[PDB]
Amino acid sequence: MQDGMYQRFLRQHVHPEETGGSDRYCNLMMQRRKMTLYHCKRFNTFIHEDIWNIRSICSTTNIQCKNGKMNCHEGVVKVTDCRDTGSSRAPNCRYRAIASTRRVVIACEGNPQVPVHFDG
């Protein structure tokens, strides 16, 4: 199931080619990546790093996930956080964006390991 989870992780959180950082980028990507299909996803982060840079976070020392498990890892990466404004409903979802290079936390599973969940 880690391959279905890994694929959903890429679609929802990975975009190496762009740098984003604007409301317009959130409005476009949230839609293109299928997160406003039936409802406006309240909050989402996009990681602007190479796929191998992110799979490589799985190899760092283990830390606690918000759920108690110890299969989470951290890394400082360029991201764009998109927050729903609440003005409208799907499919016309409007977001506000914040850009930064910050510490993120992801869950890795399988052998070999792959990112299967974005913790925080």
Side-chain angles (χ1 to χ4, degrees), residues 40-54:
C40 303
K41 183 168 207 238
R42 196 188 274 147
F43 187 71
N44 198 73
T45 304
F46 283 103
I47 305 153
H48 310 304
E49 304 279 334
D50 283 321
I51 282 179
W52 279 110
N53 277 325
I54 304 158

Side-chain angles (χ1 to χ4, degrees), residues 40-90:
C40 303
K41 183 168 207 238
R42 196 188 274 147
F43 187 71
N44 198 73
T45 304
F46 283 103
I47 305 153
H48 310 304
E49 304 279 334
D50 283 321
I51 282 179
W52 279 110
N53 277 325
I54 304 158
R55 290 195 27 174
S56 172
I57 288 167
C58 294
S59 295
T60 46
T61 304
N62 264 124
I63 66 160
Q64 196 174 314
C65 304
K66 288 180 185 169
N67 68 3
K69 292 184 226 215
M70 299 279 295
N71 62 330
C72 278
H73 312 267
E74 43 125 314
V76 196
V77 302
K78 288 207 299 193
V79 314
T80 291
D81 288 312
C82 301
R83 178 239 214 339
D84 179 19
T85 66
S87 38
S88 47
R89 344 194 251 100

